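hey can u run this one w/ cytidine-5'-triphosphate bound, need the structure tokens asap thx
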Amino acid sequence: MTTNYIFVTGGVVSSLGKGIAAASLAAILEARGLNVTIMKLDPYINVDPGTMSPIQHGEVFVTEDGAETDLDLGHYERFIRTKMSRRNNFTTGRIYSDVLRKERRGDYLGATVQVIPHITNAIKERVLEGGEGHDVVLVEIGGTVGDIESLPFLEAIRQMAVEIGREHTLFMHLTLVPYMAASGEVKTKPTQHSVKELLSIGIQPDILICRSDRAVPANERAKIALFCNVPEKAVISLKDVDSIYKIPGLLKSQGLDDYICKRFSLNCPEANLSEWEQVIFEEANPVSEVTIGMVGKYIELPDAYKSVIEALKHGGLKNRVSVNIKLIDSQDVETRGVEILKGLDAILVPGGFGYRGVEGMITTARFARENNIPYLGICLGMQVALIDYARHVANMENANSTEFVPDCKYPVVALITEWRDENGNVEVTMRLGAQQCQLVDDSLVRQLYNAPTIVERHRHRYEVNNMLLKQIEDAGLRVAGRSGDDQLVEIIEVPNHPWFVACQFHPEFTSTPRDGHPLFAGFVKAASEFQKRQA
Amino acid sequence: MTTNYIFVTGGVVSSLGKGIAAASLAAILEARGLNVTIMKLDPYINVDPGTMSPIQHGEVFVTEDGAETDLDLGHYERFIRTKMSRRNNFTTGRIYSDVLRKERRGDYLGATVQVIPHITNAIKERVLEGGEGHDVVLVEIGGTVGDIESLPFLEAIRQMAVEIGREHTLFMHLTLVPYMAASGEVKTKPTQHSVKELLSIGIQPDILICRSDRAVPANERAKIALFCNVPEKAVISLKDVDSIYKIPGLLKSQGLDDYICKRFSLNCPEANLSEWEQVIFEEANPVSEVTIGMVGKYIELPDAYKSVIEALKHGGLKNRVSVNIKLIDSQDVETRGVEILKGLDAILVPGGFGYRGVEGMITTARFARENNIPYLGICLGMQVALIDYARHVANMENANSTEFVPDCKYPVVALITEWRDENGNVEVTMRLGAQQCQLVDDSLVRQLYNAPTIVERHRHRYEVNNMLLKQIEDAGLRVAGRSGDDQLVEIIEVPNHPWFVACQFHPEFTSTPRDGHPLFAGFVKAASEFQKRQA
Amino acid sequence: MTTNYIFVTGGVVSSLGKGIAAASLAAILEARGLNVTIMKLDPYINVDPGTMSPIQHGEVFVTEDGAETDLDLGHYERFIRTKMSRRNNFTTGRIYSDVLRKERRGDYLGATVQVIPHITNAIKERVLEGGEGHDVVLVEIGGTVGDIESLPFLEAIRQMAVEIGREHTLFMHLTLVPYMAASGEVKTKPTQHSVKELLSIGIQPDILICRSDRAVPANERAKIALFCNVPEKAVISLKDVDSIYKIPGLLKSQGLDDYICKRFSLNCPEANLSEWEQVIFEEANPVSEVTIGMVGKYIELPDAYKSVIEALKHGGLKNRVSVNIKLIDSQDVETRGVEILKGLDAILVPGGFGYRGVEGMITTARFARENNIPYLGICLGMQVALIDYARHVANMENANSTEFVPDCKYPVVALITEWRDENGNVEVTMRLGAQQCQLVDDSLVRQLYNAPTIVERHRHRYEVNNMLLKQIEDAGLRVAGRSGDDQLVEIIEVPNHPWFVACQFHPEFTSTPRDGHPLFAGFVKAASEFQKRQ
Ligand SMILES: Nc1ccn([C@@H]2O[C@H](COP(=O)(O)OP(=O)(O)OP(=O)(O)O)[C@@H](O)[C@H]2O)c(=O)n1
Ligand SMILES: Nc1ccn([C@@H]2O[C@H](COP(=O)(O)OP(=O)(O)OP(=O)(O)O)[C@@H](O)[C@H]2O)c(=O)n1
Ligand SMILES: Nc1ccn([C@@H]2O[C@H](COP(=O)(O)OP(=O)(O)OP(=O)(O)O)[C@@H](O)[C@H]2O)c(=O)n1
Ligand SMILES: Nc1ccn([C@@H]2O[C@H](COP(=O)(O)OP(=O)(O)OP(=O)(O)O)[C@@H](O)[C@H]2O)c(=O)n1
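ok here u go:
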């Protein structure tokens, strides 16, 4: 059929939750049997989030094909079944980098390359590439309407609406309707000025999503409906909610999907939100609760562990366990000591880069292993576990990673190019994306995944030194998973411990609220068993 | 002292002559003993005009250091003594290319690169680099105020005005004051809306340069003065003129330089425009007139030969000769024949690339040589002269250039890598910028330049094949100039002809109206001698 | 029958000619059998042009019902048959005067009166009032888009477009496309910025009228067409012309009327512009030429005599005569003398108010009566003719009007309440609009009109003193027209003269290029015969 497009923009302020709204609406349309997809347009000059620090942009989400993207794609995969790829997230820097490469190559035939139409042509080509092949395509424009940085994005999508037509395009505008105490009522004036910004660039909104700390009354929605020349049913109230999994139900309660299916002339059955109602049911009726400590180095911005924090909540839904996540600075463990790690039913060390705070994570891993506290290490959290076991069990003095101490005697973690031993003898590139992993029989993860092979996503450089691995294995450490040709260690386990698993890949990128994740489900389940054993 | 900046912008329309106004004002300030310089900001995505076709952007001006720049720098060097370089002209594509390279290198330290401040910081760094070291710096912003493409340029210079202060910065805004027949008066309303555009981005004009097909009356300047909150003496009338060399006198007659020197607290004597009054004197009182035919391939846009056409007028000033330049399509010579080249006192073949129309230039060179018509070839015009002489005198059948016929038997013009002969035997990279050339004694150019060595600017790839040169020399052709180590032929001359000179470099880039050029002066002088010999 | 609306605005500059383009477009639709009407929305604070000076704003047009309106209603009546009224022109001052009246009256029930919606509703009420009853209604908005003085007008008609819908509303935008000599081409950038201003206030154009000193090439129109997201048929080129009577044909040749009939779903035959083609042919092929001097006091602004100058040209179309109008300051006749009136085939003294320059008009009328030069006096031009005849034929020393000399012995012109005589004895207030007039048999105007009664429009206060009239009638003067019950003198004629007529009404408000006017046709015809005799 004909591909339909829903352009999503926001005004007044920036942190309106544009991606959450687009993902929630896409879950409704998908629930009606429609083939839906989402993409994100960022107005940054960075070519991709690969260079951005975690404390600035958030987590670096990794798709299946190995693309480093904005974390909004994690929201997309946690709401709809469609798998994101590189074509679902591009930036202004990517556009200019592509146009500049075509010009120097001479593909513009000596013409003068301009913002209009050449930059806008490059944007339309990418929006079409990621969209064509689906029924409805949701395009989220980053930034606030009225700023310089998103003007090429808005002018580009305006040309698509003209060329495609109003029977297959919709402009959905999020706006802020703030409440004033001195007025006792929410205020529509910021929406008035924001919609006037869209008109001055040739965009007429079709749907207004009103964001506020409370429901926007029907009287105030009527003023917005008349000022914007849209039907009253096209003005939706989106109040602040405690759980984002309720937002799909809120939009359907106001007929947002019925208005979109009508405008696009799509004949599809009513949405069946039973799976989202079940997710809300499990979250609202827990049996017990636990406290899991997440010891990392980017705690100053909790969004640096977005998918990890969300996957922990998913492990609680499947076990009916309420999870209280306690962010603990690993550098505080370096100075104040282990005393800060008391009162935890489980310990998780997420990934990261840089030596700052690593020794605090190595001390944290030793504390969880010796005191039989359920432990889950991811990427860097696996390295600090291998370093702890090699030092304090295998008696490898000052064993470390070449990333932190290049001239160490026992480089248990190093690049494949650097593999050596304690004598210096040798043998005779960022890994990104999904890769198959072979699980070892009689291992804990072989039972959790209930499969001989699995597929997880990577983002790391330094690997386990296979030259020093067999000595650590003789000390009791277990290898639970290998991958590829070089038999690189992917998962390690410590027997004689209630639950101690560490993996090289990032399992949080495959966890969803409706399906959970086998690793996090067993990790949270072991946390409640540890808590109950403290009668 | 402290560097002062004059930002030059334009509104209403694009073809206001912003560069002509900035260059004319810089000639006045320089005439007062001030160290002045100019720079041009282009909002194109091209990294430099090196890829733009001549029929689209105009001529590709070449500075001394070898930079391919916008032709507005030709206006700069023809008005002030300061020599332009690469730092006097950059584009939006250059800015983004520099910022993108810094990001991938990691110089931004994992931060999020944004339009503000990172793109605006990159613009301010370049404006300061080309300016610091001078008293007054004129910064011309391309495009029309109110468009998307020049918004980063305007926001960047607005931050410089705040940081530097209003005692060392001035905003000069060119505007259109059109005349309406039904109103019998010029209209100030387009200026009203244009100045409102500047206010909405944080810029208040200090000087209004009113462009119109007639002088803007003092009554209409008063309305503009009040609407813009500027003194009446800051509203200048710039009517359409027959000669751009009169514009320096028009601006000084209205005290534009006195207002700038006062605002900047510069104590300097009154401008002495005697050299510009002398240039206007020579142009207005010619003795005879001639008609010179310029046979090229980019005639559809006369700006493709901007500096060449201007240097021909400079040769007439020094000889008191009025020059009627007749643009003749070389491709018309291919089909209609030589009959179109009748009635010319001189023939000039300028540079170019591509085989289209080259055979018409080869026929044109043969016509000028056989009929004793003064001929001047530049770059490509020199190649077609060498091809003509090798074919029709040296009897080298189908002699050509490898740029046009790669497998020709006599590649008299080819890359140094391709140098071969008629038997195929061999011997045992764009040239850009100024290079020294050694003139041969008893040659025509040795007397015109009156020097053993000269310096001219290059822009070409294909050179004279030194393997086939000595056979052409035996046929009568003369080598007048060589350069560098490889003794590459720079100038050729045909004896037994009143005036026949062809050079590889572009001499039009060094010609000015106040100083002329020795080559063009002798070329135009020989044209009037040919015209007089037709009694 | 659903009434359609065509909103007409303009940008870049003010002097685009919005009214002429609206009247020309209305002439095409009317030529197809449609009932059309035009409106004018002025953003001035003046309640009506009655207070505005002639030398500053132009002529004060008078409709049939007696309304003092902008002169653009003169262009309207000269292009379509529909008669204008008070409902076809209102200003911002009128809107605020209405709203303030309803407020103190208590019609707003103690509510807070605001610009939106109260001021905008008052505008929409008046646009509907003048529009309903027709097929197509053209509403011209004064001012330039982007200025603040016309923002309520633009928001009001924007609300009407939503209520009515795009099936019965159109936005036609006039814009300037200037030519640059340094570029050798016209520039569309001002149109870009002006259209963006329209979008900022919620208006999207449907038709673009490109004004320039030359035809806008099809390449530049296609660039404007896609920038505004309109079909290339909706971008019309309207170059500068030598005669406004060519504009209806120029718009039809580009299919502007067909696009409007299509958008409004109207099925009507092709426009028949045979009358306008005849007007263009007559103007382009004159046989002889005359020079008619217009001696007045408002020559400082030519627009002060807009309909008079236009009616003189219509008198030349009916006679195939090229009329070369020469504006002469009557105050110059006072100082330089009669020598200024030399070399004129006819003399016209228009109307006005104030004693300044009147004595020069009295001298001018005497020069035409004594030298047998065709003369036409309108309103004040009739007073100076009566004053001249009373002084130099009836021997009434210093005969004058009480408007100028209140205590003159012979007040031949005075208010009806002031009527006295030379001894002081007495007998036992604006006139505006159309009033029937009775013509006297065996008179000149009786023949020209070919009717016993006529209807013309008035604008004056001072009448002919009927107490002193019989003495002037005995001296030779003849009364050719009377009106009403008081038998007020409307037309006077001087016998033993080739062509000497003076009337109190304003006949120029009835003249059209297609029908002319009996008075002006005979006036210019007399000038041609006078020119042949010299
Ligand atoms: N006139 C402007 C001003 C700023 N920017 C952009 O605005 C972005 C900042 O967005 P935001 O997250 O809202 O940060 P703040 O401007 O600080 O807004 P707030 O204080 O509400 O957080 C920057 O990327 C900058 O490029 C822009 O495009 N146009
Ligand atoms: N484009 C507009 C629209 C509205 N108004 C004015 O704005 C005023 C409304 O004041 P306000 O108290 O802000 O009304 P609301 O728009 O309803 O404010 P809010 O809903 O945010 O409480 C009205 O008098 C109206 O004249 C205006 O001048 N410009
Ligand atoms: N920001 C402004 C400034 C002016 N005006 C209005 O614009 C009108 C002026 O009309 P115009 O004939 O265009 O005057 P000028 O500005 O002098 O036009 P121009 O000089 O171009 O001939 C005035 O009535 C004034 O109320 C306005 O509404 N908005
Ligand atoms: N809203 C817009 C529209 C266009 N552009 C820029 O405007 C430039 C075109 O400039 P100009 O030389 O004036 O061409 P035209 O738009 O065609 O203007 P005109 O018709 O007057 O020649 C293009 O580079 C384009 O990037 C822009 O920045 N903002």
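Chain C has two domains: 4-280, 281-533. anyway lmk if its weird
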